[PDB]
Scaffold this motif. Sequence first.
Motif, PDB file in Angstrom:
ATOM      1  N   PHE A 184       0.814  -1.231   0.000  1.00  0.00           N
ATOM      2  CA  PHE A 184       0.000   0.000   0.000  1.00  0.00           C
ATOM      3  C   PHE A 184       0.836   1.265   0.000  1.00  0.00           C
ATOM      4  O   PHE A 184       1.996   1.268   0.438  1.00  0.00           O
ATOM      5  N   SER A 185       0.272   2.332  -0.580  1.00  0.00           N
ATOM      6  CA  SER A 185       0.984   3.595  -0.652  1.00  0.00           C
ATOM      7  C   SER A 185       1.049   4.319   0.700  1.00  0.00           C
ATOM      8  O   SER A 185       0.287   4.022   1.615  1.00  0.00           O
ATOM      9  N   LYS A 186       1.990   5.265   0.850  1.00  0.00           N
ATOM     10  CA  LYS A 186       2.105   6.031   2.092  1.00  0.00           C
ATOM     11  C   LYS A 186       0.863   6.923   2.270  1.00  0.00           C
ATOM     12  O   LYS A 186       0.273   7.339   1.281  1.00  0.00           O
ATOM     13  N   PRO A 187       0.488   7.276   3.513  1.00  0.00           N
ATOM     14  CA  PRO A 187      -0.712   8.120   3.704  1.00  0.00           C
ATOM     15  C   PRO A 187      -0.627   9.425   2.926  1.00  0.00           C
ATOM     16  O   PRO A 187       0.401  10.110   2.979  1.00  0.00           O
ATOM     17  N   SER A 188      -1.682   9.732   2.146  1.00  0.00           N
ATOM     18  CA  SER A 188      -1.637  10.945   1.316  1.00  0.00           C
ATOM     19  C   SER A 188      -3.038  11.496   1.036  1.00  0.00           C
ATOM     20  O   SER A 188      -4.039  10.919   1.484  1.00  0.00           O
ATOM     21  N   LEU A 189      -3.093  12.664   0.326  1.00  0.00           N
ATOM     22  CA  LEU A 189      -4.345  13.353  -0.018  1.00  0.00           C
ATOM     23  C   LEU A 189      -4.759  12.808  -1.372  1.00  0.00           C
ATOM     24  O   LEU A 189      -4.044  13.036  -2.375  1.00  0.00           O
ATOM     25  N   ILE A 190      -5.910  12.131  -1.433  1.00  0.00           N
ATOM     26  CA  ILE A 190      -6.389  11.467  -2.641  1.00  0.00           C
ATOM     27  C   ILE A 190      -7.803  11.894  -2.967  1.00  0.00           C
ATOM     28  O   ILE A 190      -8.644  11.928  -2.072  1.00  0.00           O
ATOM     29  N   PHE A 191      -8.078  12.226  -4.238  1.00  0.00           N
ATOM     30  CA  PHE A 191      -9.417  12.615  -4.651  1.00  0.00           C
ATOM     31  C   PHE A 191     -10.374  11.425  -4.560  1.00  0.00           C
ATOM     32  O   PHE A 191     -10.055  10.337  -5.020  1.00  0.00           O
ATOM     33  N   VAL A 192     -11.549  11.631  -3.911  1.00  0.00           N
ATOM     34  CA  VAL A 192     -12.574  10.601  -3.778  1.00  0.00           C
ATOM     35  C   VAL A 192     -13.869  11.187  -4.357  1.00  0.00           C
ATOM     36  O   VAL A 192     -14.349  12.247  -3.904  1.00  0.00           O
ATOM     37  N   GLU A 193     -14.463  10.483  -5.308  1.00  0.00           N
ATOM     38  CA  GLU A 193     -15.691  10.919  -5.992  1.00  0.00           C
ATOM     39  C   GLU A 193     -16.857  11.030  -4.996  1.00  0.00           C
ATOM     40  O   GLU A 193     -16.835  10.381  -3.955  1.00  0.00           O
ATOM     41  N   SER A 223     -20.299  10.483  -3.052  1.00  0.00           N
ATOM     42  CA  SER A 223     -21.092   9.321  -2.690  1.00  0.00           C
ATOM     43  C   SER A 223     -22.325   9.857  -1.938  1.00  0.00           C
ATOM     44  O   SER A 223     -22.460  11.075  -1.757  1.00  0.00           O
ATOM     45  N   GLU A 224     -23.194   8.955  -1.466  1.00  0.00           N
ATOM     46  CA  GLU A 224     -24.326   9.383  -0.636  1.00  0.00           C
ATOM     47  C   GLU A 224     -23.855   9.995   0.707  1.00  0.00           C
ATOM     48  O   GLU A 224     -24.594  10.745   1.341  1.00  0.00           O
ATOM     49  N   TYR A 225     -22.613   9.692   1.117  1.00  0.00           N
ATOM     50  CA  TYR A 225     -22.078  10.122   2.391  1.00  0.00           C
ATOM     51  C   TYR A 225     -21.283  11.399   2.363  1.00  0.00           C
ATOM     52  O   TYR A 225     -21.242  12.101   3.366  1.00  0.00           O
ATOM     53  N   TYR A 226     -20.632  11.701   1.237  1.00  0.00           N
ATOM     54  CA  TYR A 226     -19.777  12.882   1.160  1.00  0.00           C
ATOM     55  C   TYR A 226     -19.849  13.516  -0.204  1.00  0.00           C
ATOM     56  O   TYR A 226     -19.998  12.820  -1.209  1.00  0.00           O
ATOM     57  N   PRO A 227     -19.625  14.838  -0.279  1.00  0.00           N
ATOM     58  CA  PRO A 227     -19.461  15.458  -1.607  1.00  0.00           C
ATOM     59  C   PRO A 227     -18.112  15.022  -2.188  1.00  0.00           C
ATOM     60  O   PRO A 227     -17.239  14.511  -1.464  1.00  0.00           O
ATOM     61  N   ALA A 228     -17.873  15.297  -3.482  1.00  0.00           N
ATOM     62  CA  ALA A 228     -16.569  15.044  -4.101  1.00  0.00           C
ATOM     63  C   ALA A 228     -15.513  15.884  -3.320  1.00  0.00           C
ATOM     64  O   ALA A 228     -15.800  17.035  -2.967  1.00  0.00           O
ATOM     65  N   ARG A 229     -14.397  15.253  -2.897  1.00  0.00           N
ATOM     66  CA  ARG A 229     -13.425  15.950  -2.042  1.00  0.00           C
ATOM     67  C   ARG A 229     -12.061  15.232  -2.027  1.00  0.00           C
ATOM     68  O   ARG A 229     -11.958  14.125  -2.522  1.00  0.00           O
ATOM     69  N   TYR A 230     -11.051  15.825  -1.379  1.00  0.00           N
ATOM     70  CA  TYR A 230      -9.784  15.126  -1.160  1.00  0.00           C
ATOM     71  C   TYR A 230      -9.843  14.515   0.225  1.00  0.00           C
ATOM     72  O   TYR A 230     -10.148  15.212   1.191  1.00  0.00           O
ATOM     73  N   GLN A 231      -9.614  13.210   0.315  1.00  0.00           N
ATOM     74  CA  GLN A 231      -9.574  12.537   1.607  1.00  0.00           C
ATOM     75  C   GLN A 231      -8.091  12.460   1.987  1.00  0.00           C
ATOM     76  O   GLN A 231      -7.246  12.023   1.184  1.00  0.00           O
ATOM     77  N   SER A 232      -7.763  12.901   3.191  1.00  0.00           N
ATOM     78  CA  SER A 232      -6.387  12.896   3.664  1.00  0.00           C
ATOM     79  C   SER A 232      -6.037  11.605   4.422  1.00  0.00           C
ATOM     80  O   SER A 232      -6.943  10.860   4.843  1.00  0.00           O
ATOM     81  N   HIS A 233      -4.713  11.336   4.567  1.00  0.00           N
ATOM     82  CA  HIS A 233      -4.193  10.197   5.344  1.00  0.00           C
ATOM     83  C   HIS A 233      -4.713   8.866   4.778  1.00  0.00           C
ATOM     84  O   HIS A 233      -4.899   7.911   5.531  1.00  0.00           O
ATOM     85  N   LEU A 234      -4.905   8.810   3.440  1.00  0.00           N
ATOM     86  CA  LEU A 234      -5.448   7.616   2.792  1.00  0.00           C
ATOM     87  C   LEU A 234      -4.318   6.832   2.099  1.00  0.00           C
ATOM     88  O   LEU A 234      -3.422   7.424   1.482  1.00  0.00           O
ATOM     89  N   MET A 235      -4.380   5.503   2.197  1.00  0.00           N
ATOM     90  CA  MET A 235      -3.363   4.625   1.563  1.00  0.00           C
ATOM     91  C   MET A 235      -4.069   3.706   0.584  1.00  0.00           C
ATOM     92  O   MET A 235      -5.068   3.094   0.966  1.00  0.00           O
ATOM     93  N   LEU A 236      -3.579   3.578  -0.655  1.00  0.00           N
ATOM     94  CA  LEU A 236      -4.238   2.696  -1.627  1.00  0.00           C
ATOM     95  C   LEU A 236      -3.443   1.423  -1.859  1.00  0.00           C
ATOM     96  O   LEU A 236      -2.205   1.428  -1.829  1.00  0.00           O
ATOM     97  N   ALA A 237      -4.155   0.373  -2.238  1.00  0.00           N
ATOM     98  CA  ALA A 237      -3.525  -0.891  -2.596  1.00  0.00           C
ATOM     99  C   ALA A 237      -4.397  -1.577  -3.639  1.00  0.00           C
ATOM    100  O   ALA A 237      -5.578  -1.232  -3.782  1.00  0.00           O
ATOM    101  N   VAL A 238      -3.822  -2.540  -4.383  1.00  0.00           N
ATOM    102  CA  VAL A 238      -4.595  -3.338  -5.313  1.00  0.00           C
ATOM    103  C   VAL A 238      -5.210  -4.476  -4.499  1.00  0.00           C
ATOM    104  O   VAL A 238      -4.501  -5.238  -3.826  1.00  0.00           O
TER     105      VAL A 238
END
Length: 139
Positions: free
Chosen positions: A70-79, A81-96
């Motif tokens: 997984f990637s190091k914690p970072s600011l990633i754009f998240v489309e 959803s019913e829960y949040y507007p389109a925004r940058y989520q911070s401290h997020l790590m991605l993996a396949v």
Amino acid sequence: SGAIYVGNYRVVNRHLATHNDWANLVWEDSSRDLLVSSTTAQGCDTIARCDCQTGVYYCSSRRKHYPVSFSKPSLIFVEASEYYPARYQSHLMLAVGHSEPGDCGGILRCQHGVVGIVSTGGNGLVGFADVRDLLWLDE
Ligand SMILES: NC(=O)[C@H]1CCCN(C(=O)Cc2ccnc(Cl)n2)C1
Ligand SMILES: [Zn+2]
């Protein structure tokens, strides 16, 4: 669904927090999709304090654990959803890896302890909200 129980704290995805979590609120951050509430019982978990970039997560939609890089914690754009507007989520790590909406809350662990919880996903990616920088969870 899923939570981390450490000391007298319960860590959950902010978008899945219950009425009881909000009534016993300690801290929340919409930009991280995290909420921490207080508990009366002592928790079962311990938090990793490390820079691991490999670990294992629990995937409820497969009833299985999968190893991930997984990637190091970072600011990633998240489309939006019913829960949040389109925004940058911070401290997020991605993996396949596989994930579906109901997989949020699954724990990601390394050899040192809990690293974070499933928070986002889709198209063969899975995103985890990091908790390793929250030093006050132990103190
Ligand atoms: N952190 C967020 O903004 C999420 C709020 C709920 C909605 N969202 C998602 O990513 C949904 C989804 C699809 C596939 N796999 C997983 Cl684990 N979650 C975004
Ligand atoms: Zn580690």
